[PDB]
Amino acid sequence: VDRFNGVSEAELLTKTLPDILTFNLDIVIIGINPGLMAAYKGHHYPGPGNHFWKCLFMSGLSEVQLNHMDDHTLPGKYGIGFTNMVERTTPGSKDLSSKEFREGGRILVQKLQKYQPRIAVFNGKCIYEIFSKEVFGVKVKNLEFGLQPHKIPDTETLCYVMPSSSARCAQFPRAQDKVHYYIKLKDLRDQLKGI
């Protein structure tokens, strides 16, 4: 079956997804790594199998239904940027090693200390579990979604964790089951501008 218009999966696995980063951003969405479609398109969260653009609209973070082609307009119009913990493309997170994640978390903390957005948004618990242990030296055991009790070191950057936008996750089967975190993220951002 052909899902990538004649492009082999082995070619996509060698491709990367660029960062959409700048200064004065309210939010930076940090993914785990690119999926095969993101590597294919060269844009963040294209469908099918991803809830991100649906949740972004349902929560009120965007005024209309946006898509992956709109990712570069997000810093200027919305104050939202994009990065990932791991550079390498795989079909799923389970194809990544501990070594890649730990190297990723180090480069991620450097990137965050340069751009210093108001909120570092972890789109996936697994990446915050690895990051928090490596950076803050905390226990992974009772880790929760939402606002974290630690800031990115040397910055005023907050850490906010969300269930991955991937539709592989059966615990939050629909975009509607994830929207709560997007709404609480919209509220946290609104509170920062208010205060």
Next chain:
DNA sequence: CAGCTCTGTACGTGAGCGATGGACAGCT
């Protein structure tokens, strides 16, 4: 024993690819 990590595993939903079937229209 007490807190921790580690690892195999099952799980709902909705989009899209390739195949299928009923409707439909051409054919002095």
Next chain:
DNA sequence: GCTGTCCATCGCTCAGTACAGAGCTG
């Protein structure tokens, strides 16, 4: 009536998390 296409429809694949209940170490 026979032919071949259209286009909705269908059936299969595909796009992390929490849990059980150890093991590990003070």
